Design a protein around this ligand. Sequence first.
Ligand SMILES: [Ca+2]
Lengths: 248, 56
Amino acid sequence: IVGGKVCPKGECPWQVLLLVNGAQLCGGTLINTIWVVSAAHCFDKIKNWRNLIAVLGEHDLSEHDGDEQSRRVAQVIIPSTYVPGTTNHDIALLRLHQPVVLTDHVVPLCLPERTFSERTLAFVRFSLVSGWGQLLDRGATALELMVLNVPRLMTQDCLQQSRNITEYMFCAGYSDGSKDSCKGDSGGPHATHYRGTWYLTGIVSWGQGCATVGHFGVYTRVSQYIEWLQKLMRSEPRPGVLLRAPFP
Amino acid sequence: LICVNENGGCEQYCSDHTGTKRSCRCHEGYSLLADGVSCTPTVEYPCGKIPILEKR
Ligand SMILES: [Ca+2]
């Protein structure tokens, strides 16, 4: 996160930390006790699928306080329409091997319904993005979780404000190279507040470099995937670690 | 009535039937108040609620 502040411990209870072999890989969002939404591109070059870990309750990466929670990722589900190496349909549904135990520090983010999210949330101006990614383009990632409040644009206004952006995405952020999300933040939550409740509206995806002036952040439009997400969450687990499910 | 405008006054989800007939709902872990629009938590950690801020 470039141009943000530290998320006070506990105020980003749904944020997830994805690790490969112990290494920081990506961020993700907890939407239930066994389900984590992330970003497809985070798995394009995955090393050993049998070393994928999700960490809930994490805050400061240099200290263990007992609130952290570790679970093995049992399955990573990706829409059929996703093309590795590209950016459209950048969404992934992870199934934890065992459930996280909800506590004051581990809480799921509401996955809203299609209608509510398209005609009401999609219009809330400011939302939050978080992750332990780079604090500057070509800079070092963060030790403490970062959060940044960014403004969502209209697909039309985004294109023009820049002289590649499907309807499965939406822009948000700022063009003055001062605020944005970076690599390390991919797969993290774009969360919207409405009537006393946060909901998942975007997934940190790609974007021309990090905090690149003249550019906005691109986030996967979650709303285009609620039904996909739900059908899978209500299905029975099929063998295999990496699975591609049809989309729509 | 139809709940397309202002979320039909629902705290969370709503859906409008026939004409003038609408119904607000809540995400799991919540229940709809007698009020008709408000959702109140039914479990210890409802989605989208931040315990440290909630508990004040
Ligand atoms: Ca820690």
